[PDB]
Amino acid sequence: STKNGRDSNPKMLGVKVYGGQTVTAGNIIVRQRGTEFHAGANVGMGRDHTLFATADGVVKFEVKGQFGRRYVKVET
Amino acid sequence: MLQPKRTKFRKVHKGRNTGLAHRGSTVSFGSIAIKATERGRMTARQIEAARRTISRRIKRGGKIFIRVFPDKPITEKPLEVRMGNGKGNVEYWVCEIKPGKILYEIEGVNEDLAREAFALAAAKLPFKTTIVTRTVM
Amino acid sequence: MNEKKQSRLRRAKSTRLHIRALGATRLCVNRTPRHIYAQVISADGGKVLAQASTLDASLRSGTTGNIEAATKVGALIAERAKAAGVTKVAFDRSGFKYHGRIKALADAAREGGLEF
Amino acid sequence: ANFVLNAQARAEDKQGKGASRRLRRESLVPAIIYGGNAEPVAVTLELRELVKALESNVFFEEVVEIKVGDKVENVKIQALQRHPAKNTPMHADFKRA
Amino acid sequence: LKARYNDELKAKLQEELSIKNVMEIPRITKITLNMGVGAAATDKKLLDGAVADMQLIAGQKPVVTLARKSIAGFKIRDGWPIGCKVTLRGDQMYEFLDRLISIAIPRIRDFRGFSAKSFDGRGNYSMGLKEQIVFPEIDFDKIDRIRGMDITITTTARTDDEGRALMRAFGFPF
RNA sequence: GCUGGCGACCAUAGCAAGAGUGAACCACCUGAUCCCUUCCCGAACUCAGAAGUGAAACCUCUUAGCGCUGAUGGUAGUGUGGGAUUACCCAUGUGAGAGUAAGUCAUCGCCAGCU
RNA sequence: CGGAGGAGUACGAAGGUGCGCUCAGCGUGGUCGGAAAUCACGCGUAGAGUAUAAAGGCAAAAGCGCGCUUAACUGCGAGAC
Numbered sequence: 001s002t003k004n005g006r007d008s009n010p011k012m013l014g015v016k017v018y019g020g021q022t023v024t025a026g027n028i029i030v031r032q033r034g035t036e037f038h039a040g041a042n043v044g045m046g047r048d049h050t051l052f053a054t055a056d057g058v059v060k061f062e063v064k065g066q067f068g069r070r071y072v073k074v075e076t
Numbered sequence: 077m078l079q080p081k082r083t084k085f086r087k088v089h090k091g092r093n094t095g096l097a098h099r100g101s102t103v104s105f106g107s108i109a110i111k112a113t114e115r116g117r118m119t120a121r122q123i124e125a126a127r128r129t130i131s132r133r134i135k136r137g138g139k140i141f142i143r144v145f146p147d148k149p150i151t152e153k154p155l156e157v158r159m160g161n162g163k164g165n166v167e168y169w170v171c172e173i174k175p176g177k178i179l180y181e182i183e184g185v186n187e188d189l190a191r192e193a194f195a196l197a198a199a200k201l202p203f204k205t206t207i208v209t210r211t212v213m
Numbered sequence: 214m215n216e217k218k219q220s221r222l223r224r225a226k227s228t229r230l231h232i233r234a235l236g237a238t239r240l241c242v243n244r245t246p247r248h249i250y251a252q253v254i255s256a257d258g259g260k261v262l263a264q265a266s267t268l269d270a271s272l273r274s275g276t277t278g279n280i281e282a283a284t285k286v287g288a289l290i291a292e293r294a295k296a297a298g299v300t301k302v303a304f305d306r307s308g309f310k311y312h313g314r315i316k317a318l319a320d321a322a323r324e325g326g327l328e329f
Numbered sequence: 330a331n332f333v334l335n336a337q338a339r340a341e342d343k344q345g346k347g348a349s350r351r352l353r354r355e356s357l358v359p360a361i362i363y364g365g366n367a368e369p370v371a372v373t374l375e376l377r378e379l380v381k382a383l384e385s386n387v388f389f390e391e392v393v394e395i396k397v398g399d400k401v402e403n404v405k406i407q408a409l410q411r412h413p414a415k416n417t418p419m420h421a422d423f424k425r426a
Numbered sequence: 427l428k429a430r431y432n433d434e435l436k437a438k439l440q441e442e443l444s445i446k447n448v449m450e451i452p453r454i455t456k457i458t459l460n461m462g463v464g465a466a467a468t469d470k471k472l473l474d475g476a477v478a479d480m481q482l483i484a485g486q487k488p489v490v491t492l493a494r495k496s497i498a499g500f501k502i503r504d505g506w507p508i509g510c511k512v513t514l515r516g517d518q519m520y521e522f523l524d525r526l527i528s529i530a531i532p533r534i535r536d537f538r539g540f541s542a543k544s545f546d547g548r549g550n551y552s553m554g555l556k557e558q559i560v561f562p563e564i565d566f567d568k569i570d571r572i573r574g575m576d577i578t579i580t581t582t583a584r585t586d587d588e589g590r591a592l593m594r595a596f597g598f599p600f
Numbered sequence: 601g602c603u604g605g606c607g608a609c610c611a612u613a614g615c616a617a618g619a620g621u622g623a624a625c626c627a628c629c630u631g632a633u634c635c636c637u638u639c640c641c642g643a644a645c646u647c648a649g650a651a652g653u654g655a656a657a658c659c660u661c662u663u664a665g666c667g668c669u670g671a672u673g674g675u676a677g678u679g680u681g682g683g684a685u686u687a688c689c690c691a692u693g694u695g696a697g698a699g700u701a702a703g704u705c706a707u708c709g710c711c712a713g714c715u
Numbered sequence: 716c717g718g719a720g721g722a723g724u725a726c727g728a729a730g731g732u733g734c735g736c737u738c739a740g741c742g743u744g745g746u747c748g749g750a751a752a753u754c755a756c757g758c759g760u761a762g763a764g765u766a767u768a769a770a771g772g773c774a775a776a777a778g779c780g781c782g783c784u785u786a787a788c789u790g791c792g793a794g795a796c
């Protein structure tokens with residue numbers, strides 16, 4: 001007999017809205033286990049590190065700061 | 077019987093042996109060396125047999141560098157067992173060989189004796205080989 | 214050596230970043246053993262809307278390094294900010310304790326009429 | 330003067346993977362010349378000539394003359410690529426000197 | 427001391443060490459008194475006695491020191507007190523130094539205990555002594571067992587020679 | 601032309617080494633009355649000030665010493681069609697990583713004070 | 716019926732907030748006290764920690780303390796996965 005044979009259900013993480021797309025306030029942009037992306041202007045952060053839009057506009061990805069963090073923001 | 081002292085995992089996937097040996101295909105320790113021209117698998121017993129043959133021929137008058145180490149475990153099913161019920165048990169260890177891989181180098185012996193030793197060693201190996209010498213570049 | 218200033222800037226970082234995130238006009242203060250300084254800076258953090266310090270001619274000849282000077286600087290920065298048109302600000306203590314001369318400057322600015 | 334390599338110009342249509350493989354099937358060797366005060370120049374050499382030159386050690390220390398057309402470049406061999414299995418030379422880097 | 431160094435020792439140190447700017451002059455910054463009173467788990471009283479002894483020796487309230495990381499070899503663990511310490515600056519440290527030099531040395535059993543060596547290599551000097559005696563403290567009556575103490579003098583002297591010069595100027599024996 | 605504060609940018613910008621500045625600013629500095637502070641300590645935080653110093657620290661300059669940046673050419677891989685099956689070849693499109701030549705001791709905005 | 720590990724909990728603080736603080740290791744010295752306790756100063760350094768398995772994360776530290784506290788609320792809820 002084998003001692004293996006277990007796995008967990010999928011979690012369907014990932015980028016939901018890509019750069020250049022138009023969003024409405026409340027739209028989820030990124031599902032992520034940790035902060036692979038950080039929240040920029042007009043973007044909020046949930047309790048499970050989800051990134052969501054807090055205004056209507058156009059999504060933009062960038063890299064900024066002294067730590068080289070990846071940021072996502074919404075331009076109005 | 078070369079074998080890793082410790083491994084992070086016991087059993088590994090079969091994989092696919094493709095490509096040429098861009099790394100490890102230049103003479104770097106000795107002056108003359110034997111390198112494979114065809115891909116295949118080299119077992120620890122084969123490595124030991126070739127080393128013993130070379131050492132016996134050269135009468136330990138120089139240094140032998142072995143540039144192949146078998147670190148990939150190979151499993152087998154017990155015998156008279158059906159398919160399934162988990163992966164088999166580890167049986168022996170191999171090193172993946174790509175064309176261009178240098179296997180042995182010799183330092184400090186005459187070229188004729190070295191070539192005789194390499195010719196004796198090549199008969200123990202499961203793939204075709206060739207002889208190379210150190211060049212500037 | 215240099216640890217004192219680095220620690221002060223480390224304390225200031227959190228408040229400065231939160232003020233930037235809120236997007237409010239910032240009233241930044243700075244303190245030295247000899248003088249005090251205050252600036253009103255825009256939300257983007259690039260342009261100085263107003264300033265006032267003991268280096269100004271009206272206060273430079275005085276004791277210039279105590280609570281009495283700080284109250285005058287607070288009143289003066291309040292007047293200049295009101296003239297420039299700023300009403301609501303977020304106070305930035307730049308890692309200093311909200312106490313003594315800094316507190317006096319803040320109270321004087323509030324009396325002058327900056328809502329915070 | 331001791332070492333002279335006759336070369337042809339390697340135009341843009343003779344660059345890339347397919348063109349290089351065609352050249353090596355035609356028994357030529359692509360090579361690049363770079364160095365101070367000028368722009369890189371791509372040339373093609375003869376495999377026979379290159380192997381003959383590499384058989385001698387003083388080729389790796391002397392200044393050699395690469396002639397393509399009328400122009401002449403005085404260069405030193407800088408890098409060499411070999412086939413991992415067959416040891417055949419495949420590409421060369423020359424530095425102006 | 428204090429005024430003694432402020433008026434006198436600065437000049438002689440300046441001449442002896444040949445330093446152009448006055449701020450280079452060795453200055454004794456602080457004195458740290460430590461009793462590493464281990465194995466306090468078994469009894470829980472010797473640490474109280476050590477705290478009382480430190481409070482008596484130095485005119486300050488001692489602070490207990492807890493362990494960091496739990497060690498199987500001893501009975502120490504992550505959070506419980508395993509030592510006691512005090513730091514002295516300003517007038518208090520000058521008074522402690524003068525009392526030490528004046529009275530501690532005669533009251534030790536064997537003289538020449540301290541060495542001109544045992545410097546940290548950067549101008550700070552540590553000395554360890556046995557017993558809480560040699561101080562103006564209560565005698566063997568009304569005290570617990572004798573306990574050793576470490577005294578580390580941290581000074582602004584950049585090098586060991588400068589530290590030794592400052593120490594000799596202050597008059598510590600060796 | 602220097603000094604301080606706040607930003608843009610986040611190594612071609614950093615680290616290290618050497619050098620320089622006290623008119624103003626800054627820094628060290630004096631004291632522990634009152635405000636306030638130490639699981640003890642005026643060390644930090646805080647207050648009241650100007651006897652000293654540019655030593656330390658901060659800034660500015662110089663250096664390719666570590667670091668960082670980095671071509672061209674070639675090689676590996678790869679979509680489509682065809683030919684072969686140790687897994688490669690041809691046509692066409694695409695094209696690294698490593699290494700080589702080489703570059704770098706940053707570049708800008710607002711406010712205030714001195715000469 | 717492929718290769719490897721965990722869960723069927725814990726916590727009124729180990730939650731909230733304001734303020735504050737940086738780990739690990741090594742080398743020097745220093746009573747018992749040493750390989751390793753505690754003290755002092757330096758060197759390159761996140762290699763520490765995060766109640767617990769691993770992964771993705773963590774300087775405004777999400778790591779570590781102190782004072783006061785109950786938002787470990789009630790009615791909901793545009794808009795999304």
